[PDB]
Amino acid sequence: CDLPQTHSLGSRRTLMLLAQMRKISLFSCLKDRHDFGFPQEEFGNQFQKAETIPVLHEMIQQIFNLFSTKDSSAAWDETLLDKFYTELYQQLNDLEACVIQGVGVTETPLMKEDSILAVRKYFQRITLYLKEKKYSPCAWEVVRAEIMRSFSLSTNLQESLRSKE
């Protein structure tokens, strides 16, 4: 697609927000260390040409609610989350722009849903981990790094690359 022609580094800012949002370190919370298992299998091939945009949209939508919940809103700074909501809606607006026009969704069969279906099962496990630790600060830290890696893995198909020096 070619609707939004301004910037393309909103994903790096979304993760930068997740970085300032961590109150504790993953090393401090190695008791709740649990890799949920981000489904990058549907984010490594056939998802770098306006084909996984609908997946990044539903992914940022799941992170938008996972973080908008009063449990995550109280788990993180409401101001750091405030900017995180504007960044989630910023990437959601760009991701939606492609979906608005015929672009984004093409002859590609429903197989594209497997990328969103994978991210939905990934976040489903993240929600269970939250209900298990009862929204523990350590569980939220593990979920913080898990959201950062899952989001960087989904945005790795666009510009989420630190290789630039």
Side-chain angles (χ1 to χ4, degrees), residues 26-157:
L26 182 65
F27 288 93
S28 189
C29 282
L30 292 166
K31 313 176 195 300
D32 290 0
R33 174 65 78 73
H34 264 278
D35 186 10
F36 299 119
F38 172 78
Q40 192 213 300
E41 184 183 2
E42 224 67 66
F43 278 96
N45 183 64
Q46 195 60 213
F47 291 107
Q48 301 177 58
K49 294 180 296 299
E51 7 196 55
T52 193
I53 296 182
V55 190
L56 304 188
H57 187 274
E58 298 295 81
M59 172 194 227
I60 293 191
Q61 212 295 297
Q62 289 287 68
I63 296 176
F64 191 82
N65 185 207
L66 172 71
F67 283 66
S68 188
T69 53
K70 59 93 64 61
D71 308 73
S72 189
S73 185
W76 309 108
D77 293 346
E78 71 287 277
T79 300
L80 292 178
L81 270 184
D82 188 8
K83 201 176 179 300
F84 190 61
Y85 299 131
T86 304
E87 182 61 65
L88 289 167
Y89 237 85
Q90 180 59 64
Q91 293 297 80
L92 274 169
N93 183 62
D94 298 344
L95 289 168
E96 185 180 358
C98 287
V99 182
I100 301 305
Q101 310 309 302
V103 291
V105 299
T106 64
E107 276 77 277
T108 304
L110 289 176
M111 60 175 266
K112 58 186 178 180
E113 190 181 358
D114 291 298
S115 298
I116 313 184
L117 219 171
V119 177
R120 80 94 66 182
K121 295 179 293 180
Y122 175 72
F123 276 75
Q124 200 64 63
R125 183 64 180 297
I126 302 178
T127 308
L128 197 161
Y129 206 86
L130 294 168
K131 270 67 177 55
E132 218 69 7
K133 275 62 181 179
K134 303 175 183 61
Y135 295 103
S136 180
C138 267
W140 265 118
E141 213 304 295
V142 172
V143 177
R144 184 120 299 342
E146 289 285 299
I147 292 289
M148 202 175 275
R149 224 196 198 181
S150 57
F151 190 67
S152 57
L153 286 165
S154 277
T155 52
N156 180 215
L157 294 312

Side-chain angles (χ1 to χ4, degrees), residues 7-12 152 154-164:
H7 295 261
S8 194
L9 299 176
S11 60
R12 185 66 65 180
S152 57
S154 277
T155 52
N156 180 215
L157 294 312
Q158 299 287 66
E159 292 282 67
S160 185
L161 278 172
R162 61 180 176 297
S163 48
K164 188 176 65 182

